[PDB]
């Protein structure tokens, strides 16, 4: 997961100042499931 | 003259400005990730914008 | 020469909105719909020959604060990011024309639509507004009153004045112009200077600017007591027959008795009153107004961050990391400093000092009582009406009635010479 | 709707490209800051020295979330 | 409901006039659960 940029880079993956701080409040979520029952969708 | 007339017709054709650059009389604004270095060379007139990407 | 044009708006004094309402706004715009009311204020104070008063405007500082509040509450409409000037209302008021020429009653549709909720302690840049950017003369004319408002709103105390001593300022044209004000008073000189500045913005190092700085320096030196009839600054001084009176009158004068010795160089500092009784002193407000008019194209030095509250720090054109200190004083103690300096100089006697002290004490008692009564009345009105809360005078606290850094301020002003 | 709010960088009435938008923050909308929160529950301290003053991000609340979190208080 | 007491200011648990009459229509309900799926909440 290396990186290299030319002239300039708005983000540096291997640079300094980044933060890795897992927390219960932040968690991590996506869209796993939705409510699509036939009767309720109509 | 023919090439110039074609260019002016292209300019005056229909459409919109699809770039994030718009003119102001205050100063010449330079995008953050532009190759230009004129701001370093000069001392007055040019301003680089960090939020303009 | 000034390069950045920024200004700060007034902050809520404990309320949830700008301390002004429809009644006060109408009383202010009673005779003219232009929000720029410097000339109207000059007419209202009536040359400072007496104690002005009214039902809604108890003092001159009251009107000054109300002008500041009205401008702060109204200017936030065209300075929104969309930059529209006449689509929203503020207290049944709308701008007329994009060039910010006057305030009129809102149309029926805008009256039906909700009004704008203003914010506190906003900092704005004049060049952001397209019309102000386009027109330089208009911007320079407006920025004088904007600078006066900023100088009043920068801290929680009274207005700020700038004192500078420099021998190289004097020249032939300056002497010729200064000689014409031999018998006039400070109020009249301020009136004429302000009208001239309004007619034409001054340049960086013009005759009018230099003479204004000289006049301010002379007034402050005379007020402290370093300069008097027997010790003059190039045969010029200010005379006050009744020191400690409710309405003091200062007259320019010349004397050939003696001229003080001035060290070469350039020195300057920043002065302000802290006691609330500045609301009834026309001279201090006029000095602050003159400094504001000067600030249009002069770029005064920076003010140190540690002397202002947190919300006023790091203003691009006004405050900075390393800047000059603000010296605050109390009028009653400064009177005693004046008397003591004159007595040490040997031109005043103990009985005269005692008379001046008694008069000053009486004046302080009267002003304190009136200010407290008016503050209590304002509090009661705010308690009664919860939807149109207002303030008639800039809020103050009980602690501000005591002497502060008066001795240090007097010493600094004396060392200026 | 849902997601996060976006604002036009610099001038307005000029949004024709995705590069002219940036995420909105509490600095742009001051009444979403901590200091302007209505402290009817007493959670926020009343001491001025204990209240943080920093910039914060913003998110969009859906009506489903509104209804469910409103119905949550009925248990109380 | 409420075992024994003697105050008799607003309501009297041990007094007369109260009615205990369960029925199907009235039933008894509270807030047992809610729809708090991450996908729907967003």
From Swiss-Prot, chains A, E:
Report residues carrying sugar chains. 3, 12
Q: What is the effect of changing residue 2 to A?
A: Complete loss of myristoylation and binding to sigma-3 protein
Q: Where is the lipid attached (N-myristoyl glycine)?
A: 2
**What is this protein identified as?**
Outer capsid protein mu-1N
Q: Which domain of life is it from?
A: Viruses
Please give the first and last residues shown and the length of the full protein.
1 to 42 of 708
UniProtKB/Swiss-Prot annotation, chain B:
Per the record, the domain of life is Viruses
Q: Can you name the source organism? A: Reovirus type 3 (strain Dearing) (T3D)
Quaternary structure, from the entry: Interacts with protein mu-NS; in viral inclusions.
Instruction: Report the sequence similarity comment from the record.
Output: Belongs to the orthoreovirus lambda-2 protein family.
What biological function has been recorded for the protein in this entry? Outer capsid protein involved in mRNA capping. Catalyzes the last 3 enzymatic activities for formation of the 5' cap structure on the viral plus-strand transcripts, namely the RNA guanylyltransferase, RNA-7N- and RNA-2'O-methyltransferase activities.
Shown part of the complete sequence: 324 to 376 of 1289
Q: Where is the protein localized? A: Virion
- State the name under which the record lists this protein: Outer capsid protein lambda-2
Curated annotation (Swiss-Prot), chain C:
Q: Where is the signal peptide?
A: none
Q: Name one GO cellular component term.
A: viral inner capsid
Cellular localization per UniProt: Virion
* Amino-acid biosynthesis keyword on record: no
Record's keyword annotation contains Cell cycle: no
Per the record, the major location class is: virion
Name of one Pfam family that matches? Sigma_1_2
Other observations noted: Mutant ts447 is temperature-sensitive.
By sequence similarity, the record places it as follows: Belongs to the orthoreovirus sigma-1 protein family.
Q: What does this protein do?
A: Inner capsid (core) component.
Description of how the protein assembles with itself and partners: Interacts with protein mu-NS; in viral inclusions.
Name the UniProt record assigns to this protein: Inner capsid protein sigma-2
Give the source species. Reovirus type 3 (strain Dearing)
